[PDB]
Structure 1
Amino acid sequence: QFEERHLKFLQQLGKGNFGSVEMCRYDPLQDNTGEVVAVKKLQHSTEEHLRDFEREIEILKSLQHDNIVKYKGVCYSAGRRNLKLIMEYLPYGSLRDYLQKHKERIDHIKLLQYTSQICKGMEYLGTKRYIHRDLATRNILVENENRVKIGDFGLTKVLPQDKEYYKVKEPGESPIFWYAPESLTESKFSVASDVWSFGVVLYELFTYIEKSKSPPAEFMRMIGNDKQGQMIVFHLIELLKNNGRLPRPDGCPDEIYMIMTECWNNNVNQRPSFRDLALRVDQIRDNMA
């Protein structure tokens, strides 16, 4: 629906897995009246990354939720080359950068509002049997001060109709400090592994994205910064199996930290559901108000 000749590049917004996102104005009338949009592209169009990108486009197009970034259309050139995903532009950027900049004027009640919106969006994904596999504050976008949206689905997979997990091992670098143990050991991804990752997102929010408090920084210090290459994931696996966890962030209440630790259960089946997470968060949020 979007013609490439009317997409005017403005600036780069971010770079994720196998591609980037650009700020563009779609100005078909060429009179500077078109809306600003976000455009995702692949940095190199391999036929494996292309079909993964086409599956990502179909996944986002089928999601309609207040806390999921809105799909707008597609755009390609020469026949069907240079596929581009057109999304709504969210003016405040990623939640990670937003929280780090406004940390002094974002209180705990506001964090729980973001936490509850992420949970409702994740529950919506579960009803479609989608596994996000990449939940992190860098992948959450801020529409305004009162609303956030899950903003990237490059690693999202559809569950098989006969199983409740999806096995996959991507060649490259994986966000192992957000990964559930069964994802590190067996490459199994499920709703329960998304719940593990959500607990790390909750940890991120209450550290206010502080320098030395990031999950990679805390985990690499616990296993020792001595560890090299593949012995990092080996020592991370052993640390989690012995119930080594991220510490409680400064100023985080006990009831909020216990939600994280309950999300960080080695027993896959004992982790809470996203509906129960939204319930406990909402009731805590109401008690504070």
Structure 2
Amino acid sequence: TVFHKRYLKKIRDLGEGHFGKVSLYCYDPTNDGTGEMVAVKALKADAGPQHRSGWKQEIDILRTLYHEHIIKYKGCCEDAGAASLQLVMEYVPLGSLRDYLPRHSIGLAQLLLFAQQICEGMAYLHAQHYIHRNLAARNVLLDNDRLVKIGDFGLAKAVPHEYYRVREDGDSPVFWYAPECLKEYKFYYASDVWSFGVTLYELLTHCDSSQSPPTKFLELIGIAQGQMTVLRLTELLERGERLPRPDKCPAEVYHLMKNCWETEASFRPTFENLIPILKTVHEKYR
């Protein structure tokens, strides 16, 4: 599919993606305002050869993924300004779970349905042989109060092999990362399950920033540490220390969370394992 830049009417900026920014447009070929509202992802113009090869990878990943709990790719556009392409996605107006949950009081049942949907989308992603590497509430879009979709794929990679070797990066979401990613710089399919546990914790805390993984971990570690945040994080996780049980979170749900956080990656449930578990848990509390 292809969109004409000539009919893209900028409305506002949505935020920052990994290789550039996300912007809201009205694609209006008839010029009457009835046009579809689209979310467009662009390559930041001053990007080097490294950020450009990474952007082409994300484009390719996004134009092949089709799942009901994964953001719908619409097509592309020629970005004459950055001499590349602009990724046209469906606009999800209610936004991210990180933005939505602290402003709307969502019940336990719905939060579990969201977790179930994240798993459905993630089991599909793993079957397509890709790892997400950035599974967080921030990257989960709410289509409606009963429908959630994985919305960002900036750090997503193809697994040829059960793990991918990651680079020592400063933009890595370390507070959502398994010990083997921090220690060995290896990202397994199971590493994505650790992140789901963290995403699940964020939902049961309603994305309250005072209860957030960075706030919680940086209270435990402290900030007197000189270039030793990741080391202390790896160390506290080895000691078996974890983020606490969110208020009013069911006991067995916290057990599932703690199981997604097994130090040994092999002892963590797959995304396929979690789908029947979460369907049952959602039914029990609905």
Range into which the TM-score falls when normalised by the shorter chain: over 0.9
- Is 1:14 the counterpart of 2:15 in the alignment? yes
Matches within 5 A, 1:203-222: 203-222=201-220
| 1:166/1:188 contact within 8 Å kept | yes
Q: Using the TM superposition, give the Cα deviation of residue 148 of structure 1 relative to its aligned residue in structure 2, in angstroms.
A: 0.7
Paired with 1:179 and 1:80, the residues of 2 have a C-alpha distance of 32
Q: Using the TM superposition, give the Cα deviation of residue 15 of structure 1 relative to its aligned residue in structure 2, in angstroms.
A: 1.2
Paired with 1:224 and 1:79, the residues of 2 have a C-alpha distance of 44
Matches within 5 A, 1:65-80: 65-78=67-80
- Is 1:37 the counterpart of 2:34 in the alignment? no
Give the counterpart letter for 1:227 in structure 2: Q
Paired with 2:128 and 2:208, the residues of 1 have a C-alpha distance of 34
In structure 2, stretches of 5+ residues that fail to align are none
Q: Using the TM superposition, give the Cα deviation of residue 47 of structure 1 relative to its aligned residue in structure 2, in angstroms.
A: 2.3
Q: 1:197 aligns with which of 195, 198, 207?
A: 195
Question: Alpha-carbon deviations, 1:205-244, whole Å to 9, x = none?
Answer: 001111310000111111123224x210110011111101
- RMSD of equivalent CA atoms: 1.4
Q: 1:167 aligns with which of 165, 168, 173?
A: 165
Matches within 5 A, 1:263-278: 263-278=260-275
Which has the higher mean CA deviation after the structures are superposed, 16-25 or 110-119? Answer: 16-25
Question: Alpha-carbon deviations, 1:176-221, whole Å to 9, x = none?
Answer: 1001100001111111000000000000000111131000011111
Alignment match, 2:143 = 143
Q: Using the TM superposition, give the Cα deviation of residue 29 of structure 1 relative to its aligned residue in structure 2, in angstroms.
A: 2.1
Paired with 2:79 and 2:69, the residues of 1 have a C-alpha distance of 31
Paired with 1:133 and 1:125, the residues of 2 have a C-alpha distance of 12
Which has the higher mean CA deviation after the structures are superposed, 123-132 or 273-282? Answer: 273-282
Q: Using the TM superposition, give the Cα deviation of residue 82 of structure 1 relative to its aligned residue in structure 2, in angstroms.
A: 4.2
Q: Using the TM superposition, give the Cα deviation of residue 80 of structure 1 relative to its aligned residue in structure 2, in angstroms.
A: 7.8
Give the 3 Å change call, closer, same or farther, for CA 218–79 of structure 1 in structure 2.
closer
Give the counterpart letter for 2:77 in structure 1: C
Q: 1:180 aligns with which of 170, 178, 181?
A: 178
Q: 1:240 aligns with which of 237, 240, 245?
A: 237
Q: 1:250 aligns with which of 247, 250, 261?
A: 247
| 1:66/1:149 contact within 8 Å kept | yes
Q: 1:99 aligns with which of 94, 98, 101?
A: 101
TM-score (norm: length of structure 2): 0.96
Question: Alpha-carbon deviations, 1:150-189, whole Å to 9, x = none?
Answer: 00101100002xx100002154321110011000011111
Question: Alpha-carbon deviations, 1:251-287, whole Å to 9, x = none?
Answer: 1111111111001011111100112112111111112
TM-score (norm: length of structure 1): 0.95
Paired with 1:267 and 1:200, the residues of 2 have a C-alpha distance of 16
Percent of paired sites with the same residue: 51
Give the 3 Å change call, closer, same or farther, for CA 198–77 of structure 1 in structure 2.
closer
Q: Using the TM superposition, give the Cα deviation of residue 32 of structure 1 relative to its aligned residue in structure 2, in angstroms.
A: 1.6
| 1:219/1:236 contact within 8 Å kept | yes
Alignment match, 2:65 = 63
Which has the higher mean CA deviation after the structures are superposed, 217-226 or 41-50? Answer: 41-50
Give the counterpart letter for 1:81 in structure 2: A
Paired positions, count: 284
Q: 1:54 aligns with which of 29, 52, 56?
A: 56
- Is 1:110 the counterpart of 2:107 in the alignment? no
Which has the higher mean CA deviation after the structures are superposed, 211-220 or 73-82? Answer: 73-82
| 1:176/1:233 contact within 8 Å kept | yes
Paired with 1:58 and 1:6, the residues of 2 have a C-alpha distance of 24
In structure 1, stretches of 5+ residues that fail to align are none
Alignment match, 2:92 = 90
> Secondary structure of the equivalent of 2:102?
helix
Matches within 5 A, 1:152-163: 152-160=152-160, 163=161
Alignment match, 1:130 = 130
- Is 1:279 the counterpart of 2:276 in the alignment? yes
Paired with 2:283 and 2:140, the residues of 1 have a C-alpha distance of 24
